Write a protein that binds this ligand. Structure first.
Ligand SMILES: [Mg+2]
Ligand SMILES: [Mg+2]
Ligand SMILES: [Mg+2]
Ligand SMILES: [Mg+2]
Ligand SMILES: [Mg+2]
Ligand SMILES: [Mg+2]
Ligand SMILES: [Mg+2]
Ligand SMILES: [Mg+2]
Ligand SMILES: [Mg+2]
Ligand SMILES: [Mg+2]
Ligand SMILES: [Mg+2]
Ligand SMILES: [Mg+2]
Ligand SMILES: [Mg+2]
Ligand SMILES: [Mg+2]
Ligand SMILES: [Mg+2]
Ligand SMILES: [Mg+2]
Ligand SMILES: [Mg+2]
Ligand SMILES: [Mg+2]
Ligand SMILES: [Mg+2]
Ligand SMILES: [Mg+2]
Ligand SMILES: [Mg+2]
Ligand SMILES: [Mg+2]
Ligand SMILES: [Mg+2]
Ligand SMILES: [Mg+2]
Ligand SMILES: [Mg+2]
Ligand SMILES: [Mg+2]
Ligand SMILES: [Mg+2]
Ligand SMILES: [Mg+2]
Ligand SMILES: [Mg+2]
Ligand SMILES: [Mg+2]
Ligand SMILES: [Mg+2]
Ligand SMILES: [Mg+2]
Ligand SMILES: [Mg+2]
Ligand SMILES: [Mg+2]
Ligand SMILES: [Mg+2]
Ligand SMILES: [Mg+2]
Ligand SMILES: [Mg+2]
Ligand SMILES: [Mg+2]
Ligand SMILES: [Mg+2]
Ligand SMILES: [Mg+2]
Ligand SMILES: [Mg+2]
Ligand SMILES: [Mg+2]
Ligand SMILES: [Mg+2]
Ligand SMILES: [Mg+2]
Ligand SMILES: [Mg+2]
Ligand SMILES: [Mg+2]
Ligand SMILES: [Mg+2]
Ligand SMILES: [Mg+2]
Ligand SMILES: [Mg+2]
Ligand SMILES: [Mg+2]
Ligand SMILES: [Mg+2]
Ligand SMILES: [Mg+2]
Ligand SMILES: [Mg+2]
Ligand SMILES: [Mg+2]
Ligand SMILES: [Mg+2]
Ligand SMILES: [Zn+2]
Lengths: 63, 112, 252, 135, 77, 91
RNA sequence: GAUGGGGAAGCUCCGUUUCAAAGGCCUGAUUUUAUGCAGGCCACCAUCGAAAGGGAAUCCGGUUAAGAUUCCGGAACCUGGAUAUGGAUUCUUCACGGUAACGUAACUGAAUGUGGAGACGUCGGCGCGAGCCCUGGGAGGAGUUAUCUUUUCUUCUUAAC
RNA sequence: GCUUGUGACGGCCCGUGAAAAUCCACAGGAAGGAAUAGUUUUCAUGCCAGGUCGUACUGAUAACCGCAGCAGGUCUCCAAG
RNA sequence: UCUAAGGGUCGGGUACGAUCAACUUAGAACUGGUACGGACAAGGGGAAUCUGACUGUCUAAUUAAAACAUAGCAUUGCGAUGGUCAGAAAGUGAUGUUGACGCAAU
């Protein structure tokens, strides 16, 4: 039941919080999530041809 | 729950005393000791792990057919093929050039 | 009084070398037929680090003129020598970095490493990370050659004494501040048990001719005599001058 | 010249027959659905005649001089074109595309080639071609 | 330590000089997704390893069992 | 976003040992960690590994060199002094 | 830490391949006969020193008042020794196939040489495994039921080879 | 996710992080080998044998060391919500 | 008690659809005797003088310090028939698998 309200976003206020934001969820983790996604959207648009390879190669380094 | 004990008398975490956990048909967990891992044999020329060759701890190679200990071509399971290609070409050339050295100085000994 | 520290180092108990990780002792080829009538070829098969040693060794293998087999020698690698490099060793050998030639057969000014005091002693002078010797002289009658060592000291030895062309690798190692006790610690950890160092002046008099007193002081001249006796020689043994070497150095 | 031609000798440089010397007997200079690359059909020597000596007598010389041959389709990119060259006329027709595929035909092909290589060797023709390349 | 399928290769095990005992097992088992069927394994003890041959179809298994050597000492079920 | 004004790699030592020593170390670390050109195959792919030992990433050649840099001032001015003197004895 | 040795009045001290005439192997030679001599190597030069280093090979189930990777049950694997049958191989004698990386059920190989394995620091993030953790359906068993909860708890396992 | 294993990488060094037994491979080609029948046990299957000593239990606020069933000391593995 | 943002998986001729599974983060209402890291867990801060640079080290069982060490600095000895040191001696020994970018001594 608790876990339900948890995943219902409850009991997660500033006052139910004892580890630093970093420690709760690594900034780095967020990044790797984020980046790997951009990285591989790029890949499929390339694989499709929705995007060309040159524009892809810019966006990659741009991402 | 359900922890596990070492199955042998040695009680420490030495390389030769790794443990793996396992569910028996009894429905319980049990330690099981785990031999150190084999390493791939290496080319004596360059040094890469050489392919084709089965990878065993060294005495396990005594009970395995000779085909797990070689690839076909000369210097079978001993050098790395690209490493043998190198040999052959060099062999040929050096042996060729050797001739170019003889006949040239044989000309020197007549033209001096 | 107590036997002092420098007297104890002698019986080599906790004081002997740390040996264990060592590559082997660095030596020139034995002075055989080949090396003194002609030259013989090897390949540096590997240049390699020797624990507690400044400069890299060079594993260099040769054919055995008398038995079908290989014999591997261990060289101190001169700078610029590389794996695969062919290495020539002998009287009638040519003058390139890495080769090993009898000090006789090299023109004055030549620069060589690992040079033999006597011929065939397989290399004694100039082996440390950076050092070398330079031929300054050549006297055919009683065939000697004169070199200047790294110390500055000039010495005359026989022309047949061998040396290797070039300077030893890993130079400039001593330019870098150790920075901390640890780097030093780890340094001596692969040499010998000489670190760290208590000052005699912080010991009690049992311990040292510098020990004791109500303030820390040497209390008598610290320049000890040559003829001093064991347990006496601590401080500046045989010193003939002392103090900040004002002035240029170099050996005129 | 388009030098990978009619009787050019070469050293196989990859595969089971690596280091062995051959004779190019027919070049497909380009093409083959089957073999989509520049490649040659070669007769070669697999088990060289082992050195012979004055001590060697009678039927031992007989043995020592036996050759085991082979025949290969092989990529140009796997030969070392040699300066040397050896005649191929006695087994022009033996070694062919048709020869390869159907083992039964390969086997016969070798039989000929073997006789050819073994006559050749006595009367010391082409001696290089029977001197195993050491490496 | 061994599974087998070539139904002839098997028939030679049963007539291998060293092969003294056999044993036949029968399992209730379900097919495809709907109904079930009667599985039968043919176990043969060699000196070094125990070969077993799963004949799924009951039909095949019936005459297979008559085939079994009249001197072979089979453990039924 | 330039991360520091001047300590550079030497930033690991924080305040310790004092500016001077740190500078001196900073120079030779920039020396010793940096990637060099291979004389043999020409890719900048030679990194150090233990003082004096310089090895090429691809192509695997390994040259004995200086403790913190590859070619040491002297070694090369020796190399030239050997160039010179050798050439006296074919001439 | 013995040994030829070298010190020491001596108990003993030094040295460990050291300034030494330092040993044993493969097979032929035997067909008086069992092992003399016939080749050729091989010159390594004691030995002790690890129940955490290296290292040939076993697992599950059951069992005892008290033993169990040790018994019993079943299924394995290693080392030595013997060896026959089947297969493979050969009239092109010592295999074939793939362009190649390489394949394989095999597929002769003394001296000698060489290569590998044994065999190797530490910390960091990332990737995958396993056991554990969490959880849906279902098939059982248990608990709570004034009231409430298609509920709470629990079994649903798979060894070496 | 947790523990642990493991990989491909990356940082570090004036530190670059044992040895030997043992196993296999290759280079070599001494030799020895068939057609009226040879070669082959590094393929499969088959036969026999595997000695000696240790093995119980405690491993600690009572089985060890501290005069003792001493609040001390004494090296480790497994680890649920 | 709501709101918004952050993902996976598939077919597309040579713009989107369809579902599957995750606690993070920000904001917005309501609400209570103004309470809420509610127990547990968890830094007192500042301005100076003396003093040792730092981290490390020691008087087990009255001294942990400003003492020892240290990196840095400087001096000394030494080319091996050698420096320093060991041993009653010696075909003895440490440094030394060493060589002045070294070893030894302050
Ligand atoms: Mg970050
Ligand atoms: Mg993704
Ligand atoms: Mg790019
Ligand atoms: Mg136990
Ligand atoms: Mg560890
Ligand atoms: Mg293979
Ligand atoms: Mg394989
Ligand atoms: Mg061969
Ligand atoms: Mg005294
Ligand atoms: Mg020692
Ligand atoms: Mg110390
Ligand atoms: Mg001090
Ligand atoms: Mg000092
Ligand atoms: Mg100092
Ligand atoms: Mg004091
Ligand atoms: Mg005194
Ligand atoms: Mg005095
Ligand atoms: Mg005093
Ligand atoms: Mg003072
Ligand atoms: Mg003794
Ligand atoms: Mg022992
Ligand atoms: Mg042991
Ligand atoms: Mg052990
Ligand atoms: Mg049990
Ligand atoms: Mg009993
Ligand atoms: Mg018990
Ligand atoms: Mg049993
Ligand atoms: Mg059994
Ligand atoms: Mg056996
Ligand atoms: Mg076959
Ligand atoms: Mg070996
Ligand atoms: Mg190795
Ligand atoms: Mg180890
Ligand atoms: Mg459970
Ligand atoms: Mg096992
Ligand atoms: Mg742990
Ligand atoms: Mg490394
Ligand atoms: Mg191997
Ligand atoms: Mg002979
Ligand atoms: Mg077998
Ligand atoms: Mg016995
Ligand atoms: Mg027990
Ligand atoms: Mg108790
Ligand atoms: Mg007691
Ligand atoms: Mg107690
Ligand atoms: Mg959403
Ligand atoms: Mg969606
Ligand atoms: Mg302090
Ligand atoms: Mg402190
Ligand atoms: Mg005290
Ligand atoms: Mg006291
Ligand atoms: Mg304190
Ligand atoms: Mg106190
Ligand atoms: Mg100062
Ligand atoms: Mg004497
Ligand atoms: Zn390169």
């Amino acid at each position: 039941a608790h876990a339900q309200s948890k995943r219902e976003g409850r009991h997660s206020g500033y006052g139910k919080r004892k580890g630093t934001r970093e420690a709760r969820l690594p900034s780095q983790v967020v990044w790797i999530r984020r980046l790997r996604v951009l990285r591989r959207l790029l890949a499929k648009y390339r694989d499709a041809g929705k995007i060309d390879k040159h524009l892809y190669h810019v966006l990659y380094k741009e991402s | 729950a359900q922890r596990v004990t070492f199955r042998r008398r040695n009680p420490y975490n030495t390389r030769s005393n790794k443990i793996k956990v396992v569910k028996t048909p009894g429905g319980i967990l049990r330690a099981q000791h785990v031999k150190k891992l084999a390493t791939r044999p290496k080319c004596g020329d360059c040094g890469s792990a050489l392919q084709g060759i089965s990878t065993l701890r060294p005495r396990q190679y005594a009970t395995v057919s000779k085909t797990h200990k070689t690839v076909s071509r000369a210097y079978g399971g001993s050098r790395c093929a690209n490493c043998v290609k190198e040999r052959i070409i060099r062999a040929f050339l050096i042996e060729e050039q050797k001739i170019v050295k003889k006949v040239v100085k044989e000309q020197t000994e007549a033209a001096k | 009084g107590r036997v002092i520290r420098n007297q104890r180092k002698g019986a080599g108990s906790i004081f002997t070398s740390h040996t264990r990780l060592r590559q082997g002792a660095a030596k020139l080829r034995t002075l055989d037929y080949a090396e003194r009538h002609g030259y013989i070829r090897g390949i540096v098969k590997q240049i390699v680090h020797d624990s507690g040693r400044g400069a890299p060794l060079a594993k260099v293998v040769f054919r055995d003129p008398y038995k079908y087999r290989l014999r591997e020698e261990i060289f101190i690698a001169n700078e610029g020598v590389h794996t695969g490099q062919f290495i020539y060793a002998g009287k009638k050998a040519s003058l390139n970095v890495g080769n090993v030639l009898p000090l006789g057969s090299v023109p004055e000014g030549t620069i060589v490493s690992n040079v033999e005091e006597k011929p065939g002693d397989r290399g004694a002078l100039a082996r440390a990370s950076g050092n070398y010797v330079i031929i300054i002289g050549h006297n055919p009658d009683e065939n000697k050659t004169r070199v200047r060592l790294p110390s500055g000291a000039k010495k005359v030895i026989s022309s047949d004494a061998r040396g290797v062309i070039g300077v030893i690798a890993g130079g400039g190692r001593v330019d870098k501040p150790l920075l901390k006790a640890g780097r030093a610690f780890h340094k001596y950890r692969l040499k010998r048990n000489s670190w760290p160092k208590t000052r005699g002046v912080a010991m009690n008099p049992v311990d040292h001719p510098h020990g004791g007193g109500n303030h820390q002081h040497i209390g008598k001249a610290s320049t000890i005599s040559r003829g001093a006796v064991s347990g006496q020689k601590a401080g500046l043994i045989a010193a003939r001058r002392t103090g900040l070497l004002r002035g240029s150095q170099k050996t005129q | 010249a388009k030098f990978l031609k009619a009787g050019k000798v070469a050293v196989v440089v990859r595969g089971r027959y690596a280091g062995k010397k051959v004779v190019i007997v027919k070049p497909h200079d380009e093409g083959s659905k089957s073999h989509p690359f520049g490649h040659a059909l070669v007769a070669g020597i697999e088990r060289y005649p082992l050195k012979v000596t004055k001590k060697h007598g009678a039927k031992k010389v007989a043995k020592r001089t036996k050759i085991k041959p082979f025949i290969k389709v092989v990529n140009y990119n796997h030969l070392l074109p040699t300066r040397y060259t050896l005649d191929v006329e006695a087994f022009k027709s033996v070694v062919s595309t048709e020869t390869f595929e159907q083992p039964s035909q390969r086997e016969e092909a070798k039989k000929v080639v073997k006789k050819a290589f073994e006559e050749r060797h006595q009367a010391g023709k082409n001696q290089w071609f029977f001197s195993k390349l050491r490496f | 330590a061994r599974e087998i399928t070539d139904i002839k290769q098997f028939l030679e095990l049963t007539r291998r000089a060293d092969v003294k005992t056999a044993t036949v097992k029968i399992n209730k088992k379900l097919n495809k997704a709907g109904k079930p069927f009667r599985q039968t394994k043919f176990k043969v003890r060699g000196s070094s390893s125990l070969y077993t041959l799963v004949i799924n179809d009951a039909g095949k298994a019936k005459k297979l069992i008559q085939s079994l050597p009249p001197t072979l000492k089979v453990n039924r079920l | 976003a330039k991360r520091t004004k001047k300590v550079g790699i030497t930033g690991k030592y924080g305040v310790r040992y004092g500016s001077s020593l740190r500078r001196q170390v900073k120079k030779l670390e920039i020396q010793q960690h940096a990637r060099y050109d291979c004389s043999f195959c020409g890719k900048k792919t030679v990194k150090r590994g233990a003082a004096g030992i310089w090895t090429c990433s691809c192509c695997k050649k390994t040259v004995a060199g200086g403790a913190y840099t590859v070619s040491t001032a002297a070694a090369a001015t020796v190399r030239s002094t050997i160039r010179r003197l050798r050439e006296m004895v074919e001439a």
